[PDB]
């Protein structure tokens, strides 16, 4: 099936995407600051 | 996102407004002198 295949593609978009935001972040506070 | 390229677009313009106060309080300083 796909639902385990799909719950499996879910986890690691989820993680790439904390990543992108604790990168973001990151950057946004060290140019304002 | 609007945030890390304004505070960029930001400092980018307050560098040039302290230069541009630089060669302007100077240009004062000596005419009068």
Known sequence: LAG???AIIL???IITA???A???INMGL???Q
């Open 30 to 32: 060290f140019v304002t």
């Open 22 to 24: 604790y990168v973001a």
């Open 4 to 6: 385990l295949d799909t």
């Open 18 to 20: 904390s990543v992108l």
């Open 11 to 13: 986890i690691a978009f």
